[PDB]
Design a protein around this motif. Structure first.
Motif, short mmCIF file in Angstrom:
data_model
loop_
_atom_site.label_atom_id
_atom_site.label_comp_id
_atom_site.label_asym_id
_atom_site.label_seq_id
_atom_site.Cartn_x
_atom_site.Cartn_y
_atom_site.Cartn_z
N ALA A 89 -2.17 0.69 2.45
CA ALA A 89 -2.77 2.00 2.68
C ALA A 89 -3.04 2.78 1.39
O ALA A 89 -3.40 3.96 1.43
CB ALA A 89 -1.90 2.81 3.63
N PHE A 90 -2.88 2.12 0.25
CA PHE A 90 -3.16 2.72 -1.04
C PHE A 90 -4.65 2.76 -1.32
O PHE A 90 -5.45 2.17 -0.59
CB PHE A 90 -2.50 1.91 -2.16
N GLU A 137 2.71 -2.50 4.24
CA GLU A 137 1.92 -1.42 4.84
C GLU A 137 1.55 -0.33 3.83
O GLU A 137 0.41 0.14 3.79
CB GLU A 137 2.64 -0.84 6.06
N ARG A 138 2.51 0.06 2.99
CA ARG A 138 2.24 1.04 1.93
C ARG A 138 1.10 0.59 1.02
O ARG A 138 0.03 1.19 1.01
CB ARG A 138 3.49 1.31 1.09
N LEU A 182 1.90 6.39 6.40
CA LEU A 182 0.94 7.20 5.66
C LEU A 182 0.41 6.48 4.43
O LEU A 182 -0.50 6.97 3.75
CB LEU A 182 1.56 8.55 5.26
N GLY A 183 0.96 5.31 4.14
CA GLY A 183 0.48 4.53 3.02
C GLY A 183 0.64 5.22 1.67
O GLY A 183 -0.33 5.37 0.93
N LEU A 184 1.87 5.63 1.36
CA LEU A 184 2.20 6.22 0.07
C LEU A 184 2.94 5.20 -0.79
O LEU A 184 3.76 4.44 -0.28
CB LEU A 184 3.11 7.44 0.26
N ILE A 201 -5.71 6.12 5.96
CA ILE A 201 -5.88 4.84 6.65
C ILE A 201 -4.87 4.77 7.79
O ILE A 201 -3.68 4.67 7.56
CB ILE A 201 -5.67 3.67 5.70
#
Lengths: 92, 73, 170, 237, 75, 72, 73, 65, 82, 77, 84, 44
Positions: D185-186, D181-182, G51-53, G11
């Motif tokens: 979302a990059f 997921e990370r 949060l897609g970090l 996203i």
RNA sequence: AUACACAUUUUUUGGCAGGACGGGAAGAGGAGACGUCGCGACCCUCGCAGAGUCGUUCUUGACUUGGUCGCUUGAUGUUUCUUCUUCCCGUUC
């Protein structure tokens, strides 16, 4: 000025199919020269029809010692060369 | 001189069919547009393989390189 | 003293004359894949760090007793064993495509000790035993021919159908 | 003693020495075993989750459990998960674990370990329920169950292993799903730098020349000084 | 774009071998930067054995991209 | 724009390149040239039985497609 | 003639985007009664991972902030 | 590619033939000059010693150390 | 220009062997080599993939059609070592 | 001893029936009159016919734009 | 560093002659020469050696050695090899 | 566990690659040990 | 200390279509061209030098230009046509 005319010609030309594909995030199917087909969504394109494709499902045809069988696989992140493209079809 | 580009421009917005070098595929559809490198866009396309209708494809793009010739229908 | 990987890493590594490739073995002693010369190799071992890129192996001038302990090396075509003390040969050698073996000036005594060379399938074309006591024993040449007919050139002499037939007669 | 021991020959870069397990490959293969593309990496992981449950992977299967492609896939995947498990926990006795699982398989699983108050007793091999334990037992000698248990044994067992090993690795499964997921979302630059990091971690010495050994813990007059005349340093000769 | 130094071959009879195992014979007329060639008295040598005078005086053109190689019959 | 630059971003990425000849390639991109000539290390390669190779350089025009990680 | 730039880097995670409106209202009430005004507000997240970090950032933050995301966050 | 200079390299041709030789120089088209280059076909069997060769970048598939 | 083009221009006047995309081999003295690899060749002995061998006086083949050339080893000395 | 483009131009003016040999295809060849061409040797060819050699039959195609890449050998008949 | 050998059975092909010569003379030290330049066989082979002591040792030890039927004659080369 | 200590002294935290490494090393060590224990049982 | 690398010669393409295994020999019902590189030799041939010359200086710059016969069952691709049994030696279970 030259850049402008290039982007415009691209927009109203045959490329409009792949442009439309990226903006709508619509699936398109691509007949390739390997006799394999790729149905996917267009993430990016290029003048050479180089592409980044997401949610790729490639279908193909294989012959065995009995009836021909179609084979297919899912490739989520696929980058594709531009000369492999025979045809790009856009459909509902 | 009547060049292929003006003939093709006049062919835009008309029912056409295109035979590829492979001849494994012909495409009959309305000619929507063609670019300076001669890539082809057709609509309502129909695929004729071995002279028989394979199916109705619809809005279709043809890589210039594969095109053997185009004829008006 | 021992042939160990630390030695495997850093000998004068280059390409044979013959353009045969390899990567040599000398941290302080005995070598492999090129010039395994003059560092008192007792027993061959640790060939794995050779990791296959070698056409040739110039073992000469070491103190090798027997030829076993060969990992599977597809690439090795030539072994230059000269000036050691090879008494025996392993038998399950079978490094496929070992075309050339140089046993010159060693201590192989008996015909029967040569038997394991028959195992080399059809690749061992060139074999040189000259400089061993076994050469003096009677019908040495004919016994090598009847035992390993795969050899095309023995002791830098070529086999020939005449002594092939004599080897059959005896 | 172990001077030629190298982890990178046991772990891939995407596994990060047990941090994650690389399941993209299986998304390719497993996803293709469906002959379409409607399946995303995340939806695939959603599929895998079934195998954390004791009953879901059995009663709500992604595909029909008698499908060939499916059973083959499941085999490959199971093998992977198991090797990964023991790979990431060298210190635990592998044989002990293996035998434990095998005995659980024989003594419980194949003995009507799955029971429902409504449908009775489910059988992994025949994929059918049974009213009472009585008919269940007299069904374990029938030609049908003999056939099935004799043909689909290896697959059933592999399925089971995938189950229990995935349970033992719940933390790693979650950790990876998170990673997915990370990265997903990059942005471009972000994803690139992250990859750089995974790479560096992969090709870095296990001990740095800069590590510690034996560092154990226990348990105003602003305008006034310019006015004074220090705008220009004065000197007595 | 470079021009092929074909002037030495001008007005000479030559055997061109072309893709698809095709072979034609004719007098080198003209050429261009593209290596496209005009051949007069062109004669197709079919794979069988006979030959057909395709362009006795009407002359033909061969695309340079298809020209595999060209042999000089004369000196 | 130019996707080749997007490939230039792909250093140290593990990828599976299918080629026009049908060959499968698996390895970590060390660099890609603008020609899309791809240099990779730690490559297992399957010609249409895998050969393991330290470094492999590929001429860009031969590349059919490259399959990237889904994490990208 | 100002230079264009990107400001939206968000996203929405699938699990968040699956939430219904009633779900979102409820989440806001439970988060110390968050009140919003304005059009088009994205739904609240409940986990740093939604949060897609990058992993670096994640490690760093946790480290930087201990425990659950606050209502404002 | 400049690092590969002077090395013994294995090029795979467009026709499947394998060539091996020292890489002396390249160019833009990836035309390579290979010193003491030999050809292998099937895998040794059908090996020939060519010597110094140019290869055309249009034919080259891949190279390996 | 390409450095290999420079070498190939040095090869003029020598005996070279050419293999074309078809597979035929032309050995002979190279008269002339253009930048486009178009080569003019003399007294050529040709060996076909079938094994048949012919002799021809003057031959000129397009650059694009050439698979590869072999040139004499005399040139290997210099100045391409730099 | 004339450039090929001028040769094609005299085909244009004369309006002679033209036979094109295509690339890597012996089986079929195309025929018809050249009404126009461009720098890429793409040709609008009128009353064109496909001629399979494999007595010869053919398919009437009418007006055609043939791409120049196929062109192997342009002739007159 | 280079030794000139002659009086050898020329009937042996070039590449096999070179491989057997490199083989035989590797016992004394690394042979640097890859190939016979002289391309005439008839024994006239030159063997180049990285160190000089290996050349001298080969010369003294392999005089008149039976090699492919013939006793080889070995001498020191008149000039230095181009590779040296 | 948290303070990474066994009795009184809290030890420096190590990175994953090293922990795993040493774990595999200890693995082979335990293998050796098991072997020796075996031969010993067969000799005593 | 101070733009470009998709329209004919290259990279945006004319491409696609006890049981098994090997080897070697024997006995019964794989061979013929056409080439290209090798085991031996009754043969040929007989020797130190990429080669040959010069200007200037202790080492460089210019200018010209194995072949033959057998195989007594050597190795290899185009291209047409039509296996069993026994014994020995290796791997695997």
């Amino acid at each position: 000025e030259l850049e402008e005319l290039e982007e415009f010609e691209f927009k109203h030309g045959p490329m409009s199919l792949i442009n439309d594909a990226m903006v709508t995030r619509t699936p398109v199917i691509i007949s390739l020269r390997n006799n394999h087909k790729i149905i996917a969504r267009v993430k990016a394109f290029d003048r050479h029809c180089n592409m980044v494709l997401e949610n790729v499902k490639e279908l193909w045809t294989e012959k065995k010692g009995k009836n021909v069988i179609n084979r297919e696989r899912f490739i989520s992140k696929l980058f594709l060369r531009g000369d492999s493209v025979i045809v790009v079809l856009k459909t509902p | 001189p009547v060049n292929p580009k003006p003939f093709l421009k006049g062919l835009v917005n008309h029912r056409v069919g295109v035979k590829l070098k492979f001849n494994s595929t012909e495409y009959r559809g309305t000619l929507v547009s063609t670019d300076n490198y001669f890539n082809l866009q057709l609509n309502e396309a129909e695929e004729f393989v071995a002279g028989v209708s394979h199916g109705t494809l619809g809005e279709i793009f043809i890589r210039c390189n594969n095109v053997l010739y185009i004829r008006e229908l | 003293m021992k042939f160990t990987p630390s030695i495997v890493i850093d000998a004068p590594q280059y390409y044979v004359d013959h353009f045969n490739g390899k990567y040599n073995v000398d941290k302080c002693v005995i070598l492999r894949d090129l010039q395994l010369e003059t560092d008192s190799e007792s027993m061959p071992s640790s060939l794995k760090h050779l990791t296959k890129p070698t056409h040739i192996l110039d073992l000469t001038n070491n103190d090798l007793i027997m030829i076993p302990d060969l990992s599977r090396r597809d690439d090795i075509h030539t072994l230059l064993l000269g000036r050691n003390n090879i008494v025996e040969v392993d038998g399950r050698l079978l490094p496929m495509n070992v075309q050339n073996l140089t046993l010159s000036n060693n201590s192989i005594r008996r015909f029967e000790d040569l038997q394991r060379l028959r195992r080399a399938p059809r690749t061992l074309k060139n074999l040189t035993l000259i400089g061993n006591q076994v050469c003096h024993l009677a019908n040495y040449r004919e016994h090598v021919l009847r035992l390993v007919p795969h050899l095309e050139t023995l002791d830098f002499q070529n086999v020939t159908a005449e002594e092939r037939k004599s080897a059959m007669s005896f | 003693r172990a001077r030629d021991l190298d982890l990178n020959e046991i772990f891939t870069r995407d596994e990060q020495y047990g941090e994650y397990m690389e399941l993209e490959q299986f998304h390719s293969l497993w996803l293709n075993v469906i002959k379409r593309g409607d399946c995303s990496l995340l939806q695939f992981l959603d599929i895998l989750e079934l195998f954390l449950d004791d009953e879901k992977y059995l009663l709500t299967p992604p595909m029909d459990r008698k499908n060939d492609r499916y059973m083959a896939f499941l085999l490959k995947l199971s093998k992977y998960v198991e090797t990964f498990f023991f790979k990431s926990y060298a210190l635990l006795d592998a044989a002990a674990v293996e035998n434990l699982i095998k005995s659980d398989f024989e003594h419980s699983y194949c003995r009507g370990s799955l029971r429902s108050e409504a449908k009775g007793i489910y059988c992994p091999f025949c994929s059918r329920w049974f009213k009472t334990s009585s008919v269940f037992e007299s069904h374990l000698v029938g030609k049908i169950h003999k056939k099935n248990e004799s043909k689909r044994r290896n697959f059933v067992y592999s399925e089971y292993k995938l189950h229990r090993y995935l349970k033992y690795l719940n933390d790693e499964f979650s950790r990876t799903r998170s990673f997915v997921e990370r990265k997903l979302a990059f942005t471009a630059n972000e994803r690139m730098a992250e990859m750089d990091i995974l790479t560096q971690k992969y090709e870095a010495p296990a001990y740095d020349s800069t590590e510690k050994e034996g560092a154990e813990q226990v348990d105003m007059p602003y305008w006034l000084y310019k006015l004074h005349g220090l705008d220009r340093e004065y000197r007595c000769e | 774009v470079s021009t092929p130094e074909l002037k030495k071959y001008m007005d000479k009879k030559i055997l061109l071998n072309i893709n698809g195992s095709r072979k034609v014979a004719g007098i080198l007329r003209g050429y261009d930067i593209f290596l496209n060639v005009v051949l007069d008295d062109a004669m197709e040598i079919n794979g069988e054995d006979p030959a057909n005078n395709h362009q006795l005086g009407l002359q033909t053109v061969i695309r340079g991209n298809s020209i595999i190689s060209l042999e000089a019959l004369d000196a | 724009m130019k996707l080749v630059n997007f490939l230039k971003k792909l250093r140290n990425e593990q990828v599976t390149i299918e080629l026009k000849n049908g060959t499968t390639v698996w390895g970590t991109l060390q660099s890609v040239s603008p020609q899309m000539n791809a240099i990779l290390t730690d490559v297992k390669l399957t010609l249409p039985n895998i050969a393991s190779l330290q470094y492999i350089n590929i001429r860009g025009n031969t590349i059919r497609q490259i399959i990237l990680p889904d994490s990208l | 003639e100002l230079e264009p730039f990107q400001k939206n880097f968000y996203i929405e995670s699938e699990t968040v985007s699956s939430m219904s409106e009633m779900e979102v209202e409820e989440l806001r009430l439970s988060l110390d009664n968050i009140k919003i005004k304005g059009t088009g507000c994205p739904k609240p997240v409940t986990k740093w991972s939604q949060l897609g970090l990058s992993t670096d950032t994640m490690v760093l933050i946790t480290k930087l902030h201990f425990g659950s995301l606050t209502p404002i966050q | 590619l400049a690092n590969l200079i002077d090395y013994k390299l294995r090029v795979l041709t467009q026709d499947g033939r394998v060539y091996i030789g020292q890489l002396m120089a390249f160019d833009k088209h990836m035309n390579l000059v290979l010193n003491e280059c030999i050809e292998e076909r099937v895998p040794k069997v059908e090996k020939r010693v060519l010597g110094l060769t140019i290869l055309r970048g249009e034919q080259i598939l891949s190279t390996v150390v | 220009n390409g450095i290999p083009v420079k070498l190939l221009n040095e090869a003029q006047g020598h005996i070279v062997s050419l293999e074309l995309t078809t597979g035929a081999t032309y050995r002979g003295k190279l008269v002339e080599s253009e930048d486009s690899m178009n080569v003019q060749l003399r007294d050529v002995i040709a060996t076909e993939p079938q094994g048949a061998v012919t002799h021809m006086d003057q031959i000129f083949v397009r650059g694009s059609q050439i698979k590869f050339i072999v040139v004499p080893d005399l040139l290997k000395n210099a100045p391409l070592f730099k | 001893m004339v450039p090929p483009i001028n040769c094609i131009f005299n085909f244009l003016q004369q309006q002679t029936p033209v036979t094109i040999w295509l690339f890597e295809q012996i089986g079929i060849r195309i025929k018809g009159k050249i009404v126009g061409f461009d720098e890429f040797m793409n040709v609008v060819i009128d009353e064109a016919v496909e001629i399979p050699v494999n007595v010869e039959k053919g398919t009437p195609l009418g007006k055609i734009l043939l791409k120049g890449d196929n062109i192997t050998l342009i002739t007159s008949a | 560093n280079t030794l000139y050998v002659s009086q050898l059975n020329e009937k042996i092909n070039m590449q096999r002659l070179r491989v057997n010569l490199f083989l035989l003379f590797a016992t004394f030290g690394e042979v640097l020469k890859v190939s016979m330049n002289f391309k005439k066989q008839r024994g006239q082979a030159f063997i180049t050696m990285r160190t000089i002591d290996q050349a001298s040792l080969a010369q003294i030890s392999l005089n008149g050695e039976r090699f492919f039927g013939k006793p080889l004659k070995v001498e020191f080369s008149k000039s230095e090899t181009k590779t040296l | 566990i948290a303070e990474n200590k066994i009795y009184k002294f809290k030890k420096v935290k190590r990175k994953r690659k090293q922990i795993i490494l040493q774990q595999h090393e200890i693995n082979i060590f335990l293998r050796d040990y098991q072997e020796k224990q075996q031969t010993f049982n067969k000799i005593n």
